[PDB]
Amino acid sequence: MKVRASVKKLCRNCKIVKRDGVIRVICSAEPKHKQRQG
Amino acid sequence: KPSIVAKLEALHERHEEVQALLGDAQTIADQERFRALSREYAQLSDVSRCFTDWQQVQEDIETAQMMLDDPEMREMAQDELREAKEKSEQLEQQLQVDDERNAFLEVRAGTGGDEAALFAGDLFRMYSRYAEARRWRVEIMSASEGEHGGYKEIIAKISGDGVYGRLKFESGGHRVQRVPATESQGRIHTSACTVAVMPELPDAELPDINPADLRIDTFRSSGAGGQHVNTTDSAIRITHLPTGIVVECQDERSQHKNKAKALSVLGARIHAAEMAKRQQAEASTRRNLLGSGDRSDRNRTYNFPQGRVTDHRINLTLYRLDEVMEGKLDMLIEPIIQEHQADQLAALS
Amino acid sequence: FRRIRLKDPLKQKQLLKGLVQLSEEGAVQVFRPISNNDLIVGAVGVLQFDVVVARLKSEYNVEAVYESVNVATARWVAKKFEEFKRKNESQLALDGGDNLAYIATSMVNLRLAQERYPDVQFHQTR
Amino acid sequence: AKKVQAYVKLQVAAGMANPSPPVGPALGQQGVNIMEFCKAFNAKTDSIEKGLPIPVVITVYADRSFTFVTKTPPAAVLLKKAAGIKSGSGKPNKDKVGKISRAQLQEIAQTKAADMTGADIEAMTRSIEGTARSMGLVVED
Amino acid sequence: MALNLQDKQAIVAEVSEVAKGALSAVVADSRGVTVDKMTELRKAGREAGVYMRVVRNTLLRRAVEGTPFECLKDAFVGPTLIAYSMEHPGAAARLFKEFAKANAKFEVKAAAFEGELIPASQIDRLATLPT
RNA sequence: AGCCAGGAUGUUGGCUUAGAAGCAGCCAUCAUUUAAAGAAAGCGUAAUAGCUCACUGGUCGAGUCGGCCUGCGCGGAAGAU
Ligand SMILES: [Mg+2]
Ligand SMILES: [Mg+2]
Ligand SMILES: [Mg+2]
Ligand SMILES: [Zn+2]
Hints:
- Chain A: Belongs to the bacterial ribosomal protein bL36 family.
- Chain A: Keywords: Metal-binding, Ribonucleoprotein, Ribosomal protein, Zinc.
- Chain A: GO terms for molecular function: structural constituent of ribosome.
- Chain A: Zn(2+) binds at residues 11, 14, 27, 33.
- Chain C has 126 residues and is α+β, with helices and mostly antiparallel strands.
- Chain C has one domain: Alpha-Beta Plaits, CATH 3.30.70.3280.
- Chain C contains 4 helices and 7 strands.
- The radius of gyration of chain C is 15 Å and the shape is elongated.
- Chain D folds into 2 domains: 7-71, CATH 3.30.1550.10; 72-140, CATH 1.10.10.250.
- Chain D is built from 5 helices and 4 strands, in the order αββαβαααβ.
- Chain D has helices at 38-45, 75-81, 102-105, 109-112, 121-134, and strands at residues 56-57, 69-70, 98-101, 137-140.
- Helices cover 26% and strands 0% of the residues of chain E.
- Chain E has a single domain (1-130), classed as CATH 3.30.70.1730.
- Chain E is mainly α and 131 residues long.
- The radius of gyration of chain E is 14 Å and the shape is globular.
- Chains in contact: B-C, B-D.
- The interface between B and D is small, with 11 and 9 residues.
- The structure holds magnesium ion (3 copies) and zinc ion.
- Zinc ion (ZN) is lined by residues 10-11, 13-14, 27, 29-30, 33 of chain A.
- Chain D binds one RNA strand of 81 nucleotides through residues 4, 8-12, 21-22, 26, 53, 55-56, 71-72, 74-80, 87-94, 97, 112, 115-119, 123-136.
C-alpha cells in the first residue's frame, strides 16, 4: 500500500474506486500497485 | 620454439581437458563454472589449433630428411618456408593480448657512483631514441646531474598511444660491465642502475562534503561570555559518517561563522586523508618495483668487452649490443611479451 | 575429503602418530602428497571428520583445524609404472599404508588420466 | 504433431560434428551422446560441403534417443559466398559493405524454395533482397 | 478498421467471383492453425495459382452482399465464421471434396459437407470429378 | 464492453560479445501467405522454451468514446492546560 498525494494508474489492470469518500487504486495483477490517497 | 613449445603443449592439453569438461551435464548445472569455461575456451582453442598445425608441419619436416635417391631440396625448402611463415603468424596473433595509457619512466643510479651516472645517461638516451623512432613524445620532468657524467636520477613522462604495453617490462635493475670513463687504469668494473616504469593515472578529486552524510550538533559554548553566551547555541560539531572525522568550533560568536569554519577544516582534513594515503601506496609500489641496486638483483646485463646483451628472465643472449644501445631494443621486448602472454593464458586455474 | 593442520606446527610428530593409529582403528584413511607434505584425511562421511578431531584432542593434545582441498576419488595403482610416475608426479600420494594413489580433481579429470595408460588403477586395496 | 518436449532447434555448421562448446552443451543437459552424430550427421553433410552452417532440429523423445532432420542453409550465410564477402554489415544505413545483383538471388531461391513459402520464385526474391538490404549488400545493376 | 470505402472493395472484388466460379463450399474452422492454413490454401491453389478467392469476410451483410447474383440459396451461411473457396477452371472441382481429405487432416470441422447449390444439392458429399 | 479462436513462414539476424534467437545496447525495420499478426509493447530463462498484448474472424444486440468552455464540492491537511 502506497500512501501518497498523487495516485495514478500504472498498469492496464489498475482501477480507480471511491470507498467512503477516499480514492484508492487496486489491480488484480501486481499487489505492488495498490495505493490510497493520503 | 626454444622454451614456449612445452607451455603451448600443456596449453593444448588444457584445451582437450576443457573439451571433456564441457560435455558432462554436471558442470553445466552450476553456471559460474560453465560461464568461466566458455569464456576461457576461445583463446585456448585458436592458439591450440595453430600449435597443432605447426606440430604437424614440424613432424613433416622431420620426415623426408633421412631419405636418398630423390631431390629432397625443393619440397623441404617450401616446407620450412611455410613452417616459418606459420610461426610468425602465430607470434603476431597471440603475442598482443586493455592498457595503452602513457607512462612515467624514472631511472636512477645504483652501485658504482660516478659511473652508474654515466650508464644512466646512456640508458636514458637509448630509451629516448626508441621513443623518438616511434613518433612518441618524451618530456623531462625532473633531473639530477651526475657530476662527471649523466644523471644521478632522471624522471621523464613519455606520451603516446600504447607506451605502457611496451615499456612495462623495462623495470627492475640493469647491470653493466665495462672499463669506465672515470678510471685511471684499465680495470673492468660492474655497476647497476634501477629503472621504474609506471602508468599515468587520473586524479579526479571529489568534494566529499555531501550534506546528506553529516551529523551536525549545535550546543552552548564554554568560557567567559557573560549572559548572552549562557542562553544560546553558538558552538558547532560536525561528524563525517563514513570517514569518521569529527571537528568542532567555538571560535566566533555567530553560529554561521562557526559552521563555515568547521566545515572548511573538515574538508581540508578529508582531502589530506586521501593524499596521504595514495602517496604511501605509490611509494610502496615504486619501492617494490625499483628493486635495490646491488649488481646482483638485475633483469638484464650488458657486456661491452664481449658486445653482448643478455636477459635473465627468459635466458636470452644476443651479440647485438651496439645495435641495442642506439635504440633498437624491440628485439629484447617481443620474446618477453610473447612468453608473458603465454603465461597469462596458462594462469587460468 | 579435507585437509588437516594444527595450531602449533611444532607438534607434527604427535599428529602423525594419532592419525596413523586412528587410521588403524576404523575408516579414516590418510594421504601425504608427493609434494609439500600436507596431510589429507579421507573419511566415508562427514561425522567422521568431527569425531577424528574430537578424539585427536581428547586423547592426544593437538587441535588440527580443517581446510577444503579439492579432490575426488583417489585410486591406487617396472619401468611401465615408473615412466607414468615421473610424468604425472604432482597428483600422486602415499597412504598410511605406504601404498600409492592418484589424487585427481574430478572424475571427468580422472578418465583422461586413465584413458592414456594401460594401468588398472584399482582402488579398493587387497 | 509433436511439439517441444525436451529438444532444441539449433546446431552448428554441419561439415564436422566438432563437439565444441557451440554444440556440446546445447544438447549437454538433454543427455544422449555427442560423438555418435558423426555417423548420423556428418555422412549427410558430406554430400553438400564442409563447414557451411545449416539448421536442423534435434527433436528428442524421453527415451533418450535423438531423431533429427536437416534443411537448407539460412540466407544469412547463403548471402555471403555468393555475395563474395564472409562478414557482414552492422551500419547498413550509413555505409554498405558489399554488392549483389538480381542475377544470383533467384539462383539460390530453389536451393531454399523447399520450405520458404511464396507465390512464385520471383516473389520469394523480394524477401531475399529484403534481408539483403539490412545486411549492407548493394543491389547491382 | 475498414471504413465505408473499402467495404465496397470487399464486395466489388468478391462479386465478380461467384459470377465466373463453380461449385463452392464453406468451412467453419473456428480453430485452425496458420501452418495448417498455409498448406490448406497453397495446396489447393497449387493446381492453378491465385485463382482462389478464398477470403474470409462472412458477416451477415458483408458476404451476403455478393450473393444476389448467384448462389442465392447459399446466403443462409450468415451464422458463425466460414470461408468461401471458388474455382474458375473446372466445374464441380475438388474444392468441395478436397476439403474432405482436409477434414481427415486435422480439420474435423468442415461445415458438414454442404457446398453451394447450383443444381439444388443438399447436405451431402459430391466426390465425383471425371478424368 | 464481455465471451469463443487465430496471433504465423527464411533472423540457431552479420553488427556485437562466451549467448543475445521478438524483448542488455548498438544499425536498419523490408518481404511471403493473409482475416490479421510488431523484423516486437510487457512478463520469463545462462541462452532457448513458455505466458500475455498489439491486430483480425465469430456470438450478443444497441448506443458508446475522449477532449474544450463553465457553478459548487473531495483528498493533499500534524502540537503542546
Ligand atoms: Mg569579558
Ligand atoms: Mg617428541
Ligand atoms: Mg480543499
Ligand atoms: Zn496495477
